[PDB]
Amino acid sequence: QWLSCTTRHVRIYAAYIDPETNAFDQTQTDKLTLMLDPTEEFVWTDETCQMVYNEFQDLVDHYEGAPLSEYTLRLIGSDLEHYIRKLLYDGEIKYNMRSRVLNFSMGKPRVK
């Protein structure tokens, strides 16, 4: 069923959920939706996420020929966990900046 790689900030859902509630948690699993970091570890302006949305087709259509297995889900999440690292290593995106614990998965800032 809905066996998706639901890692932090990487939830490639193998089932249609883009309502407030999927009403079945899967909606028969025919769309393969995705939500980006509900914990707000990164604040998003549309333009910044537009490159990720564009390369989503590069990851779902350009290099996909294997059946619906989490093998492909790791094949996606691997580059997904480094596209954000690249987008931050060049300063285009920044961290949460809210009243949460403000954890640093990639460590504190640097001086280049």
Binding site: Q1, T7, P109
Partner: protein, 194 residues
């Protein structure tokens, strides 16, 4: 020449609230921290001493720590024992399926980094915060049976550091994206028969 600077504080954070409307939530969060309940979870090399926290050596139940074996009820879960790649895709479901005043922490040095499982192995996950946002990281493999109570006392203050306007930072939005697939389905592999 700073790398990965922090975002600017957008609000000016300038406000003033009445005491008769603030002390209510103040004592409410005081109760919320002084009535926390554990959630049962424990796997491996950094767990077993949790059991001793219920006896005559260590007794954290003295503070009202009611151990609940259910996600939707409790709010405090201890990721005791070193976690691997698997048992995680169902672990995060627990954090997703409990009320919002969770304020989860960690336990076991092999869960903040993966200490004794960090030379070469395709099973162990490097830390837990790369799966779930928690607050405090607890060292020790096995974790010191007293350090956990001290870290609970530490976290006991963060909730007391909350105000009435803070009860809006748990509301969510939806970055729900409309993207489909084109691939072939796989039938269920975990066939339950003998």
């Amino acid at each position: 020449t700073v790398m990965n600077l922090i975002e600017f504080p957008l609000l000016d954070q300038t406000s003033s609230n009445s005491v008769i409307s603030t002390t209510l939530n103040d004592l409410s969060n005081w109760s919320r921290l002084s009535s926390l309940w554990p959630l049962l979870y424990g796997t491996s090399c950094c767990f077993i001493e949790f059991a001793s926290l219920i006896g005559s050596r260590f007794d954290f139940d003295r503070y009202g720590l009611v151990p609940r074996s259910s996600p939707r009820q409790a709010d405090l879960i201890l990721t005791a024992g070193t976690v691997t790649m698997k048992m995680a895709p169902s672990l995060v479901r627990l954090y997703e399926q409990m009320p919002e005043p969770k304020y989860v922490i960690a336990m076991g040095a092999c869960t903040i980094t993966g200490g004794m499982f960090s030379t070469d192995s395709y099973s162990t996950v490097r830390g837990v915060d790369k799966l779930i946002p928690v607050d405090v990281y607890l060292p020790g493999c096995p974790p010191k049976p007293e350090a956990v109570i001290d870290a609970l006392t530490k976290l006991r203050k963060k909730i007391s550091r909350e105000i009435v306007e803070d009860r809006t930072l748990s509301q969510n939005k939806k970055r729900c994206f409309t993207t489909s697939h084109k691939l072939y389905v796989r039938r269920s592999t975990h066939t339950g028969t003998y």
